[PDB]
């Protein structure tokens, strides 16, 4: 499964709310992916995700590849929203 989204966060996607996306992606049994300007990191490992330096106005995608990638992307989208990230 895949979903782009722009980010509207003013501090892009960084710090707390970043944690809890990971977090939100950790729960799920697939394999998910985080992409931003063309460079896509494991969106369950922290480090490659702040180093992605996402800022405001960015298009990001994330993917999920799994038994359970669709329930996966609806819930990441959620904790985007929740967060003030994206949508």
Same mark, same amino acid.
């Given at each position: 499964?895949? &979903?782009?989204? !722009?980010?509207?966060?003013?501090?892009? +996607?960084?710090?707390?709310?970043?944690?809890?996306?990971? =977090?939100?992606?950790? &729960?799920?049994?697939?394999? $998910? =992916? %985080?992409?931003?300007?063309?460079?896509?990191?494991? #969106? &369950?490992? $922290?480090?490659?995700?702040?180093? %992605?330096? $996402?800022? !405001?106005? /960015?298009? +990001? !995608? +994330?993917? *999920?590849?799994?038994?359970?990638?669709?329930?996966?992307? /609806? *819930? #990441?989208?959620?904790?985007? /929203? !929740?967060?003030? #990230?994206?949508?």
């Amino acid at each position: 499964a895949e &979903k782009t989204f !722009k980010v509207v966060s003013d501090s892009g +996607i960084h710090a707390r709310p970043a944690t809890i996306l990971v =977090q939100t992606a950790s &729960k799920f049994n697939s394999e $998910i =992916q %985080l992409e931003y300007n063309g460079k896509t990191v494991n #969106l &369950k490992s $922290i480090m490659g995700v702040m180093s %992605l330096g $996402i800022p !405001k106005g /960015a298009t +990001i !995608k +994330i993917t *999920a590849e799994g038994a359970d990638a669709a329930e996966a992307m /609806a *819930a #990441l989208t959620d904790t985007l /929203a !929740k967060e003030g #990230l994206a949508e």
